[PDB]
Amino acid sequence: ISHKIDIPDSAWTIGIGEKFKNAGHPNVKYPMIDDSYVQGAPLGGFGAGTIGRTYNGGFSRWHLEIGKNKYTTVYANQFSVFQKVEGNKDGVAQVLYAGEPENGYLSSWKWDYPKESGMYYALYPNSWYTYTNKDLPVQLAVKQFSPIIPYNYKETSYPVAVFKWTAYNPTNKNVDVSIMFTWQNMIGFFGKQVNVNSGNFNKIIKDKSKDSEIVAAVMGNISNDNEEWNGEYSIGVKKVPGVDISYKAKFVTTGDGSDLWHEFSKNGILDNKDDETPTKQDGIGSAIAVNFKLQPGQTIEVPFALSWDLPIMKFGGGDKWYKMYTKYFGKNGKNSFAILKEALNNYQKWEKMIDDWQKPILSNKSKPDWYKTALFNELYYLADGGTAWENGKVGEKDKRTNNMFGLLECFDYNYYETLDVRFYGSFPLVMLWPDIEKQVMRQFADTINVQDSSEFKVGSNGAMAVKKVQGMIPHDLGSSYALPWIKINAYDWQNPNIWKDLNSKYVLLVYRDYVLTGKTDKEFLKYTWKSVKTALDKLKEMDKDNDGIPDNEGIPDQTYDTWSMKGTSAYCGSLWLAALKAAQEIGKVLKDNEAYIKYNEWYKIAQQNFEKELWNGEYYNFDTESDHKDSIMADQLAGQWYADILRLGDILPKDHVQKALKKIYEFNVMKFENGKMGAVNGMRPDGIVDESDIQAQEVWTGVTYALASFMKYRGMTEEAYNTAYGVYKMTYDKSGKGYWFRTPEAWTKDGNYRASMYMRPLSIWSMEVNY
């Protein structure tokens, strides 16, 4: 069957129903998400809410409630197959799901799709399932995707998925085949406080335009309430030559399922029974099937689709917003059929658009397949990370020009656009969706001079601190449990208003976004320039010892929020140097002589003092005053890394940078499990992992990928890919820890993890920056 479909060799692959033996688990004491290794590539566009369908076939990882992660298989949601060989009395019917319900429902359906009988493949945004089963003479495959397309802000938003089936008969008998899509009416699955199924009902739409015929089920509710819970789901199929369509509008999901299954298992043909009766307590669902006869050697292809029109997202602080796709389909929540139809009539164009964007990388035969696997599959997080993309506040009067956006750091630390993390994680956005990236950075610019003098308890030490200080960049733009975009600085473990990295990272992200979009967007530099100057001016005030560099205060006052730095640090110091160099450049572009002169003066003093304070002959010391000061830090030259990307030249001597990178490769990579797991954060110069704090002993996936890109830029090609390979292997390989489609922030040497589904590893896209 893989002969009749084209799956790229770089697709991640696993057997349907394969048990994975090696899997990791959280390495922390507090409760932390662990949804198991049974995952797959998500379906759904940016800001739409996403649905994770796993490699076992189940629709199990629900991100439809924006900002929340709910792992539960909705067992009624499936593809099923019927096959009957010409000359047999009976056919066979089978749910394409390698599992079964726990207790109760749908006992009549044929569960437990057998092992060693099919494969799952993923190369985001595409995934595939092949079915090669000795009791199914006709072989089947499906290609499933959403239209996630760089430089496209329309289709990329859509709450839709397409399932393109291919069926091939390798035998010498005629075989009757049916494929059935079932879906529960999930209105009330979340957001509805009482009466969760009440008023749900299903209708059948038959669209008979010539050379189209679509048949679709629309699963909605009789209420017209404008609430997060209300809207519609649709499933449907497009008629193709040689296929007939059948349907069932209403079967009971909170029952044994035999209302539907006795029809399908007989002859693969449903009753075509319409029934718009609303349910009260029972759960209900719909079914759409196709049936056809395959001659020996014959192939047939048929598309199904799924859409969800859930127009309103609500956050825990009370704000309700329309999702981005509503711009294209409307806001009233009765548009699921329009969305489905658009997909069923345009999916072939979308396939080609995805192929067109993937082709430059896939066709580059100098790059290993593993690297391609990771580059594309890490992109899952852009849609799956609780992504919020608004098209107005519900009830909003004054029209607006922009659509605010946010990606979560992760689900365990439910913070939007954590700036210290996006410094690593935002590369795909600037490179592939630059209008979104510039919007986010304008969001940050707009916060710089916000002051909120109310106080909060700091988690690390119990002291009270001001929420938001004028001139200090925020850690984050809110929490999905509170008020994204409106109440910033949701994070409370430390006080980010005294952090020594955020203001620098902010400036560097600004200049990055100018450089990587062609050095043409002077208007973006003009919008952000006051905030850039304010940010550097405020951070200068933190230089207590007058060496020209902000001083770390013997506490975790930066992204390593449990790892103390004291005095001048390699990390914050290098970031400061590069940020000064960037601001000098912007000064030149914008003809701001006083800023150029001032930042140049600050840069020259700071650069001299940084080298003297920290250069030890082999690498740059972690810091000037900590007990662990001669640790080799993987991220010690983060400022120079960004300076390379920004084309700002040498902030530090080339020979010193080279020695430092070589040391990090020889130590932090190669002496940490033989370089097979990434770069550990801190290593002592005797070749022993630094145990001064948990973070020192962790590999950070996104720091590792960033380090790899830096090594690549500096011509250490073999070291770069070796360093990155460890992250790929841990994430995706049979020898790793089973983290596919949930890449975590960190792991320790035992392979166990902290914070699955994390933003930072999107930094693998920095390996694709083109000089």
| Binding-site entries for Ca(2+) | 543, 545, 547, 549, 551
Number of chain positions touching ligand PO8 (CB under 6 A): 10
Q: Residue type for 564, please?
A: S
Give the binding range for ligand PO8 (CB under 6 A) out of 334-342, 410-418, 587-595, 671-679.
Answer: 410-418
State the minimum distance, in angstroms, from the CB of residue 276 to ligand PO8.
48
* 415 makes contact with ligand PO8 (CB under 6 A): yes
* 417 makes contact with ligand PO8 (CB under 6 A): no
Crossing angle of helices 593-614/570-590, nearest 10°?
160
State the minimum distance, in angstroms, from the CB of residue 579 to Ca ion.
15
Residue placing its CB nearer to ligand PO8 in the complex, 130 or 695 = 695
Burial class (CB in 10 A: 0-12, 13-18, 19+), 345: middle
State the minimum distance, in angstroms, from the CB of residue 602 to Ca ion.
11
For ligand PO8, the binding residues in 545-584 under the rule CB under 6 A are 559, 561
Q: Residue type for 250, please?
A: K
DSSP code of residue 473: P
Helix or strand or coil: residue 178?
strand
Give CA–CA dist 750/24, Å, rounded: 9
Q: Answer for the pair 190, 322: CB distance below 8 angstroms, yes or no.
A: no
Give the binding range for ligand PO8 (CB under 6 A) out of 82-90, 154-162, 407-415, 702-710.
Answer: 407-415
* 420 makes contact with ligand PO8 (CB under 6 A): yes
Residue placing its CB nearer to ligand PO8 in the complex, 476 or 613 = 476
Q: Render the burial of 495-505: b for 16+ CB within 10 Å, e for the rest.
A: bbbbbbbbbbb
Give CA–CA dist 216/138, Å, rounded: 26
Residue placing its CB nearer to Ca ion in the complex, 235 or 549 = 549
Q: Answer for the pair 577, 606: CB distance below 8 angstroms, yes or no.
A: yes
Residue placing its CB nearer to ligand PO8 in the complex, 185 or 559 = 559
Residue placing its CB nearer to ligand PO8 in the complex, 319 or 420 = 420
State the minimum distance, in angstroms, from the CB of residue 551 to Ca ion.
4
Residue placing its CB nearer to Ca ion in the complex, 546 or 770 = 546
Distance of CA 555 to the CA centre of its chain: 31
For ligand PO8, the binding residues in 471-530 under the rule CB under 6 A are 491
For Ca ion, the binding residues in 532-551 under the rule CB under 5 A are 543, 545, 547, 549, 551
Give the binding range for ligand PO8 (CB under 6 A) out of 9-17, 104-112, 355-363, 408-416.
Answer: 408-416
Q: Residue type for 110, please?
A: K
Please name the residues in contact with 296: beta carbons below 8 A apart, sequence gap of 6 or more.
169, 171, 172, 173, 174
Residue placing its CB nearer to ligand PO8 in the complex, 300 or 421 = 421
Give the binding range for ligand PO8 (CB under 6 A) out of 94-102, 303-311, 393-401, 417-425.
Answer: 417-425
Give the per-residue contact string, 726-745, with ligand PO8 (x = CB under 6 A; - = no): -------------------x
Residue placing its CB nearer to Ca ion in the complex, 232 or 551 = 551
Out of 178, 182, 418, 489, name the contact with ligand PO8 by CB under 6 A.
418
**Residue 547 site contact among Ca ion, ligand PO8, none (CB < 5 to 8 Å, cut-off depends on kind):** Ca ion
**Residue 559 site contact among Ca ion, ligand PO8, none (CB < 5 to 8 Å, cut-off depends on kind):** ligand PO8
State the minimum distance, in angstroms, from the CB of residue 760 to ligand PO8.
8
- CB count in 10 Å sphere of residue 342: 19
- CB count in 10 Å sphere of residue 648: 22
Q: Render the burial of 428-452: b for 16+ CB within 10 Å, e for the rest.
A: bbbbbbbebbbbbbbbbbebbeeeb
Classify strands 70-71 and 42-43 as parallel, antiparallel or unpaired.
Answer: unpaired
* 381 makes contact with ligand PO8 (CB under 6 A): no
Torsion sign (Cα): 628, 630, 634, 635: positive
Q: Answer for the pair 44, 161: CB distance below 8 angstroms, yes or no.
A: yes
Give CA–CA dist 647/644, Å, rounded: 5
* Interacting residues with Ca ion (CB under 5 A): 543, 545, 547, 549, 551
